[PDB]
Amino acid sequence: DSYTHLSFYEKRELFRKKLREIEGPEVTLVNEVDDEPCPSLDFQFISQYRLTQGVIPPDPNFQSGCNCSLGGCDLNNPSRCECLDDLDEPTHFAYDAQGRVRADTGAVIYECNSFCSCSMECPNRVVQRGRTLPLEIFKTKEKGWGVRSLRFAPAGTFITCYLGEVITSAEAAKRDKNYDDDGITYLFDLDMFDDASEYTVDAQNYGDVSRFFNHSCSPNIAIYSAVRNHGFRTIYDLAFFAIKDIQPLEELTFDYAGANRISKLRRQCKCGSANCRGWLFG
């Protein structure tokens, strides 16, 4: 398997080159557990969803904007901003003066759009401003590859989005037939507002840093469904935030359950939590 023709120092050095080619905060690779040089070299880091055949993209004709106070929306005037039309009073932006998701924010974040009259510095464009923390892909003890932040991250800090190939329910069926006995899957259902378009995000071939997030039964980050196209919601952003205070070099983990050979891989859980459920889905 793999590319057994380049040796350790070359394979690893090609991955570091692959990370340095990512725009934004630095992403690193370290391994002090064993001798594996890096994750797969056929993986591609993307800054935006990778659509496929059969997927109806988000139609911009259903997309609206706001007025607000040409520059930056005012955090203390949530009723004026048309982007917050949804949800029940008291209407408030999902973010506080510190740019972190409020503790009373729900599972749905409503951000501004390209239609809005903001200068991109709007406080309601957190996700769209991408990753802000420098991350590190490291090798774990009993799991495969993991991720950990290098700087302290308060509760509510945005980490990054979960990206990958957006595929249809049919497409996912024929990929399952390829997963071997010990295959590793990277799926994430996109089902929170509709169930007709049963789309899914697969990170096996294309994805973001978040592909390496490990499961934990007592996680420290959660998924907030961020929405820009307020019309069609068959596709939306999967935005990770901190639900606890996270210290440097602390492993980032979430719960693989916020709502065929896949469900017959599972494997055993090893998050070291006193409240561990004992099982896992790849």
Ligand SMILES: C[S@+](CC[C@H](N)C(=O)[O-])C[C@H]1O[C@@H](n2cnc3c(N)ncnc32)[C@H](O)[C@@H]1O
């Ligand atoms: C989306 S993740 C991929 C991250 C994985 N660490 C890697 O090498 O890329 C799913 C896989 O990660 C491993 N994994 C993640 N969390 C685990 C956990 N608590 N316990 C055991 N294995 C875990 C499992 O092999 C699982 O199939």
Ligand SMILES: [Zn+2]
């Ligand atoms: Zn705005």
Ligand SMILES: [Zn+2]
């Ligand atoms: Zn606005």
Ligand SMILES: [Zn+2]
């Ligand atoms: Zn807006």
Ligand SMILES: [Zn+2]
């Ligand atoms: Zn566990």
